[PDB]
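User
Take a look at the entry that follows and flag anything odd:
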Amino acid sequence: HMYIGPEVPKEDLIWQDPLPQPIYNPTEQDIIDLKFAIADSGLSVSELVSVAWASASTFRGGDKRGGANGARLALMPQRDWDVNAAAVRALPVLEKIQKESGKASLADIIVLAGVVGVEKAASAAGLSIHVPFAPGRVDARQDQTDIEMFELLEPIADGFRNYRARLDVSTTESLLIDKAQQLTLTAPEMTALVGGMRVLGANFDGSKNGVFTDRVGVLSNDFFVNLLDMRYEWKATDESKELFEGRDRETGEVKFTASRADLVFGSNSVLRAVAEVYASSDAHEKFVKDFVAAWVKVMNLDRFDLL
């Protein structure tokens, strides 16, 4: 025997010292294992969706900064932002999962969590769908973050989580459009994300505003069906016109509450045309497929390495 054969693969070698900052290269089986770990973590759909959104939603198309790479949600100041309060209570579990595994960055794991969330919400609505996921993100550390000569702004508003920091007479609807264009979303993709994320229970503070469904955590088209249902009549609750009550016209009962961010989807002609497609009988699969595309789009905004 002359030993001139192919080099045994690195996956077969018994031992190799841990790098103090490992390069990761998760295998398909690595990703599958992480998925099961996340699904069995006891994190809810809403939390899985929340933590994923919070990490990714900082992207600015204007200059191409922000997004889920680097995992700044785990660092200051993002970890402490009011709007991220719900998201951040899920981090410690992914942090532990990341350590036990050592197969992927925390940056990747955060987005994987969103993938698992959307998949579960989909099966709860009677659909098996594959949510695309690309590994490769890295974790930034606190100092690397502190030195950077660009600035990411704590958001005055994020309509996708029905968050509005203070009223200053810039309208909530225009602030939602601003966020959306920062993320380079089209009007249809913005529309699927809002409706999706509403019924998923992704409001920053657990409020029921715009949550037009009795089955939270299920990726249905409930939001759209109930928003366009003429059975309901919509009234402002006071002079601000920031908050609305939807009452059954047949029985008088107050069924829903809503903010301006929710109501605009039925109160602008273009958005409404989109909403009425998603409301359609038998448009559920189509909605789910547009929500997924939109969601994955947002999750990948900053992935210039996937050149």
User: Anything to note?
Assistant: The radius of gyration is 21 Å. The first helix runs from residue 28 to 39. The first strand starts at residue 157 and ends at 158. DSSP finds twelve helices and five strands in the chain.
